[PDB]
Design a binder for this molecule. Structure first.
Ligand SMILES: Nc1ncnc2c1ncn2[C@@H]1O[C@H](COP(=O)(O)O)[C@@H](O)[C@H]1O
Ligand SMILES: Nc1ncnc2c1ncn2[C@@H]1O[C@H](COP(=O)(O)O)[C@@H](O)[C@H]1O
Ligand SMILES: [Ca+2]
Ligand SMILES: [Ca+2]
Ligand SMILES: [Cl-]
Ligand SMILES: [Cl-]
Ligand SMILES: [Cl-]
Ligand SMILES: [Cl-]
Lengths: 332, 332
C-alpha cells in the first residue's frame, strides 16, 4: 500500500492530489479536534496536512501511532506543540512566503480604514445616515486624521512586518519597530527607527500593528499593563494572532476611549462573533474573519508547496529533504 | 461700514473670523441654493465663501449686485461657472493643497478595500456570518486578489493623482496614467508609464481610479461606451467628482459582473442614498459620503487659507494679490 496522508481540518484536497497521487493515499477528516478524527488515520497516518482551526497538544500528538511529518498549510504554527512533536519524532513544517504581501496589504487597508474611517463611513451610509452639509461630513467622519507625521509602531519586523514598513513609509508614516530577536543593524539597512523595549514602542507610536508569531513568551503581549503604556487615543491593528492581545483589556480601553479604534483579523476565540466574547459591546471596532492571508494565488501557492513538502518527506530523508521544517531543534 | 462676506452653504465660521475680524462683516446663510440666500447678501455681499453643496450658474451669479470675489473652501470648483463669473467681474479661487494626501490615502484605502474586501468582510461579520473553516474563509472572502503585478490606471496625474501613483507603487502595482494636458516627459520624472488615449488606459488597467477635475469636456467620462472598453472584472474608484461617471451605465456593469467592484466617495447626486439613484440595487459597491478630503488638520488648513484669500482680495488688488485664483483668464 501507499503511505496515508490526511487533511485534518479540511475537506478540499483537489489542489494537492496531482502532486501526491503516486506517492500517498490522501484523505480528509474535516475535524475541529482529534476527537473527530477516525482512528484509522490516528493509527496509519504517515503524513498530515492542517490549517489553523485544529490545535494539536502533546496529548493529541501521542494519539498518532505512525505520523512522521506535519505540514501546516500556512505561515503560523502556534497551534502545534512542535516541541513535543519533535520529541515524538514528528517533524513540523510551514509555508511562510505564500501570503506575506497579502497580509501586509490587508494590514495597510486596516490601518487606512482606521485613519480614514472608510469602513465606518460605509456602514453609516447603509444604515441611512444623510450627509448633506459640510458640517455633517465633519461629524460622521469625526476622528479621521492626517497620516503624514504619524508614528506607526511595528511589533515584529519579520517578512510581513518589513512589507508593512515599506508600504507605511509611502504614506508619510514615521515607522518604528521593536524586535528583540533581530541582529544589530537591521534598522540601518531598511532606513527605519528601532526601539529596545516594548514600552518604548507603545510610548511613541500613534498606531500599533502586531506582526509577531505567537510563542511561549509573548502571550497576551497587549495586556491591561502594556495597554496603559500606549498613547492616548492610539490605534491597534492585529493580523498576526489573536492570542497576542487580551481582548478584555482591549474591550475596556475602547469603551473608555484610551484606544480610539482597533482593527482585528485574528481573535482569542475563532470563529469571531460580535455577540460573543469580551468584545461584545466594544466600540470603534473593525473585524475581518481571519482573511488577511487569503488570495486565490496565495491559496493555490501554499497548498501546492505544502503538498510538495509532504512529498519530499515521504520520498526523501527527514528532516534533511524538508525545505521549511521549524522543529529540527527538537526532532529526535 | 465693512465689506460683507458670506458663507453661502454653511453655518460655522469660527475658524475664519480671527482672520477676517477687522476686515469684513461675516455672515452665513446655510443655503442649498440661491433661493435660500436672503437678498441682503445678494445686494451687499462683496466676498463669498462656499463649499461644494451649492452650485452657482450664470443666473445665480447675476443675482449678486456687489460680489467681487468667490473663494471655494476646497480644491474642486466645478460647481461654479467661473467663465461667466469672470464675465461679471467676479474672481474665483480655491484651496488646492489642503487635502491632497488625505484624498490619496482615502483612495488607497478604497483600492485596498476592493482587493482585500476588508469592508465587505466586516459587514458580513456584523450580519452574523460564521466563518469557521478554511473553505468558508475562501468563500466569504471570495474575490480577494493579489495586488503585485496588477495594473492600476490613473486618469488625471495631478497633485492627488501623483500621490496616488507613488503610494500605489509601494504595493507592487504597475501604475499607468492618462493625462492629455501634461507636458511631454512627466512620466520619466516619476518613473511611471503613460498612455495616449483613455481607451488605452481602460484596456490595460485592472483597476481604474479617477483623479481629474470635472470640466466641460469630461462629463460622463465613464459612460456606457467607455465602460465597455474596460477589462473584464475591473475595479472602479472615484474620489474626484460624481459627474465623471454615468451611474446608470455603472449600475448595469456591476449587475452583469463586467465590473467586479466599485468604490465611490462622490456621486452624480449628493447626498448619496442606497435607496435612491441609479445605484439602488447595484452589487459589490462601497460608498463614502464625500469624505475623502476631510481631516481635522485639512479642514482647519483650508478654512484659514480661504479666509486669508478673502482678506487679500479685500485689502489688495484683484486679481494680482490673490494666490489661487482660477479664472484670471475670464476675469474682466
Ligand atoms: N514578542 C515579540 N516581540 C516582538 N517581535 C517578535 C516577538 N516574537 C517574535 N518576534 C519577531 O517577529 C518576527 C516574525 O517574522 P515572520 O516569522 O517572518 O513573520 C521575527 O523577526 C521575530 O523575531
Ligand atoms: N478628461 C481628463 N482626462 C484625464 N486627465 C484630466 C482630464 N481633465 C483634467 N485632467 C488632469 O487632471 C489633473 C488634475 O490635477 P489637480 O487639479 O491637481 O487635481 C490635471 O493634471 C489635468 O490635466
Ligand atoms: Ca491621535
Ligand atoms: Ca482581475
Ligand atoms: Cl487630523
Ligand atoms: Cl485554493
Ligand atoms: Cl489572486
Ligand atoms: Cl474645521
Amino acid at each position: 500500500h501507499m503511505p496515508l496522508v490526511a487533511l485534518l481540518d479540511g475537506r478540499d484536497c483537489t489542489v494537492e492530489m496531482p502532486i501526491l497521487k503516486d506517492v500517498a493515499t490522501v484523505a480528509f477528516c474535516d475535524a475541529q479536534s482529534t476527537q473527530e478524527i477516525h482512528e484509522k488515520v490516528l493509527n496509519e497516518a504517515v503524513g498530515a496536512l492542517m490549517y489553523h482551526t485544529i490545535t494539536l497538544t502533546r496529548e493529541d500528538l501521542e494519539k498518532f501511532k505512525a505520523l512522521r511529518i506535519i505540514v501546516r498549510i500556512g505561515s503560523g504554527f502556534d497551534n502545534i506543540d512542535i516541541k513535543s512533536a519533535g520529541d515524538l519524532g514528528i517533524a513540523v513544517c510551514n509555508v511562510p512566503a505564500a501570503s506575506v504581501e497579502e497580509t501586509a496589504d490587508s494590514t495597510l487597508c486596516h490601518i487606512l480604514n482606521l485613519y480614514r474611517r472608510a469602513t465606518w463611513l460605509h456602514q453609516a451610509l447603509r444604515e441611512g445616515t444623510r450627509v448633506q452639509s459640510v458640517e455633517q461630513i465633519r461629524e460622521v467622519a469625526s476622528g479621521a486624521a492626517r497620516i503624514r507625521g504619524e508614528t506607526l509602531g511595528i511589533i515584529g519586523l519579520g517578512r510581513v512586518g518589513q512589507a508593512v514598513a515599506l508600504r507605511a513609509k509611502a504614506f508619510g508614516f514615521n515607522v518604528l519597530f521593536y524586535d528583540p530577536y533581530l541582529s544589530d543593524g537591521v534598522e540601518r539597512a531598511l532606513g527605519l527607527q528601532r526601539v529596545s523595549t516594548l514600552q518604548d514602542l507603545l510610548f511613541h507610536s500613534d498606531c500599533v500593528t502586531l506582526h509577531c508569531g505567537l510563542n511561549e513568551h509573548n502571550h497576551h503581549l497587549i495586556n491591561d499593563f502594556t495597554v496603559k503604556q500606549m498613547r492616548q487615543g492610539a490605534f491597534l491593528v492585529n493580523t498576526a494572532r489573536g492570542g497576542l492581545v487580551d481582548e478584555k483589556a482591549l474591550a475596556q480601553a475602547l469603551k473608555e476611549g484610551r484606544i480610539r479604534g482597533a482593527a482585528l483579523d485574528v481573535h482569542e476565540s475563532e470563529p469571531f462573533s460580535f455577540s460573543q466574547g469580551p468584545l461584545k459591546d466594544a466600540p470603534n471596532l473593525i473585524c475581518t474573519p481571519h482573511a488577511a492571508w487569503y488570495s486565490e494565488q496565495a491559496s493555490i501557492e501554499m497548498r501546492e508547496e505544502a503538498a510538495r513538502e509532504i512529498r519530499r518527506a515521504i520520498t526523501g530523508r527527514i528532516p534533511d529533504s524538508l525545505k521549511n521544517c521549524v522543529n529540527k531543534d527538537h526532532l529526535t
